[PDB]
Amino acid sequence: YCSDCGADASQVRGGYCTNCGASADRIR
C-alpha cells in the first residue's frame, strides 16, 4: 500500500503512486 494515501501498491507506475504522486519509496 502507499503510506501517503493508502492506495493499493498495484497503483504505482513510473516511480510514483498514481493516486497521490508519492515517490516509489513511500510504498510499504
State the residue range of the domain holding 12.
Answer: 1-28
Fill in the DSSP letter of residue 4. Answer: T
If one counts the domains in the chain, the total is 1
**CA distances in angstroms from 13 to 3, 16, 26, listed in the order given:** 15, 6, 13
b vs e for 1-28, b when ≥16 Cβ sit within 10 Å of the residue's Cβ?
Answer: ebeeeebeeeebeeebbeeeebeeebbe
Q: Most distant CA pair in the chain: distance in Å?
A: 18
**Rounded to an integer, what distance in angstroms lies between the CA atom of residue 20 and that of residue 23?**
9
In which residue are the cell numbers 492506495 written? 7
**Rounded to an integer, what distance in angstroms lies between the CA atom of residue 1 and that of residue 26?**
9
